[PDB]
Structure 1
Amino acid sequence: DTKEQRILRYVQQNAKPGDPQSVLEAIDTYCTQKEWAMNVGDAKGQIMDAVIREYSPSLVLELGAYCGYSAVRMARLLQPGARLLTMEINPDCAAITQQMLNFAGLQDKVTILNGASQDLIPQLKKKYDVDTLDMVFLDHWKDRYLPDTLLLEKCGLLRKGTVLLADNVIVPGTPDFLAYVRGSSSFECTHYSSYLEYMKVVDGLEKAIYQGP
């Protein structure tokens, strides 16, 4: 099997169904003790939690589901009725993420879309009945952070106060995105220094709040 299948099985066998916290803990244990994986992890995850709690977003878009770690992490903190949409291009990972969400009992809160962000973003308004997004979590290919931020704006999906939160702004890094948002009058940016998941390597999140045109 694959690493991602092994992570899912480990959760199924070491967490409690319907208990998101147990699911996170199981993933973090597996990835610390058995096999590293590109989940956002607990260090950066704690920062994400603090941001979700601050903003209590009603509608979150995630770009880059992977195995569903961050989707579990965010969705468990959403208020009743709030929703997460997550985009994943890799069909095997989309299926893992769905199964992970199902195990966690969060499937009613989350919609996992299997496809490329640049193809799905233009469909959000008409096909998924989105007006504007409260928060966006960027965690897909690092060279897509900037193009997809610009596409979200073009498609009318950002409003005053939309929170963009970007993983991996140091490692692997997303230099064009970071330069752009930090140089733009349309964003108010904050850097949250942290560590790469499961590693003693500095990484960080960037929060960029959209201010309108």
Structure 2
Amino acid sequence: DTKEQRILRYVQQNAKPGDPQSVLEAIDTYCTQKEWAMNVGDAKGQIMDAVIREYSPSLVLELGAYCGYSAVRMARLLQPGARLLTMEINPDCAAITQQMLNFAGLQDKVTILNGASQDLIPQLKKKYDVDTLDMVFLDHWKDRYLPDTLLLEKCGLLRKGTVLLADNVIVPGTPDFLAYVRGSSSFECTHYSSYLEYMKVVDGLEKAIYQGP
């Protein structure tokens, strides 16, 4: 009986059907109460929104999904003609995510693929008629952030101005990923550190904008 399952359940019992905002609130609440995650709206959500709004991407790729919070958060802001593609290796998390999008009524803005990013990324151009990406959201599996970044490049999926946003990038974590995008001339970087009301970083996010090879 997983945490992400109990989150889904809580949403299904308490959120307003087809109301993404309600859904996000229900998640944020339960996790804060449970202390699985504190004020995800202010710590992570708000930052996601600002990035979406600054860039107004037509095509967003989410790599990694836990309970579907991030997918709802992004999908709810996408305008007609804009879409989210989501990848997650863990099948339960994938499914919870789908079910979470369903409840919000956002399922038609999103395409979920349950598989390894290493195997799925190279199929995007061929299998999925993707030429390049406007935005990528890296989530969940921090160890996959750098490999993913490198593979996207390799597959020719990034273009000048493609925005990467990675969640849960807090020192000393994801050491290899941060060093790379910061040191690389192909990435223009901005780090976001959410402290909420205290002194300890609650969430760290990295925005890295591809500057071409």
Fold equivalence (TM over 0.5): yes
State the TM-score bracket (shorter-chain normalisation).
over 0.9
Describe the shift of the 1:38–1:18 C-alpha distance in structure 2 as closer, same or farther (beyond 3 A): same
> Deviations along 1:47-94, whole A, 9 cap, x unmatched?
111110110100000111111100000000111120001111111111
| Counterpart contact for 1:3–1:35, Cα < 8 Å | no
Q: Cα gap change, 1:145/1:82 in structure 2, threshold over 3 Å: closer, same or farther? A: same
CA 1:76/1:12 → structure 2, altered by over 3 Å: closer, same or farther?
A: same
Contact 1:142 1:172 (8 Å CA) reproduced: no
Distance in 1, Cα, partners of 2:65 & 2:172: 17
Measured at CA, do residues 211 and 201 of structure 1 come closer, stay the same or move farther in structure 2, by a change above 3 Å?
closer
Helix, strand or coil for the counterpart of 1:159?
strand
Using the TM superposition, give the Cα deviation of residue 204 of structure 1 relative to its aligned residue in structure 2, in angstroms. 1.4
Q: 1:153 to 1:53 in 2, by over 3 A?
A: same
CA contact (8 A) 1:28 1:42 kept: no
Calculate percent identity across the aligned residue pairs. 100
Residues in 2 aligned to 1:86 and 1:197: alpha-carbon distance in whole angstroms: 32
SS of structure 2 residue aligned to 1:172? coil
Q: 1:104 to 1:13 in 2, by over 3 A?
A: same
Change beyond 3 A, Cα 1:86–1:196: farther
Larger CA deviation: 145-154 vs 35-44: 35-44
Runs of 4+ in 1 over 2 A off after TM superposition: 37-42, 195-203
How many Å apart are 1:202 and its aligned residue?
3.9
SS in 2 for 1:173: coil
Q: Secondary structure of 2:39's partner?
A: coil
Count the aligned residue pairs: 213
The DSSP-based 3-state class of the residue aligned with 1:149 is helix
The structural deviation recorded for 1:203 is: 3.1
Deviation at 1:11, TM superposition (A): 0.5
Larger mean CA deviation between 16-25 and 40-49 belongs to 40-49
TM-score by length of 1: 0.93
- Cα RMSD (Å): 2.2
With the length of structure 2 as denominator, give the TM-score of the two structures. 0.93
Q: Which residue of 2 aligns with 1:43?
A: 43
In the alignment, the residues of structure 2 paired with residue 100 and residue 205 of structure 1 have an alpha-carbon distance, to the nearest angstrom, of 23
Distance 1:199 1:146 in 2: 28
CA distance, structure 1, for counterparts of residue 68 and residue 184 of structure 2: 31
1:121 Cα deviation after fit: 0.3
How many angstroms does 1:6 deviate by? 1.2
| Conservation of the 8 A alpha-carbon contact between 1:39 and 1:66 | no
Unaligned runs of 5+ in 2: none
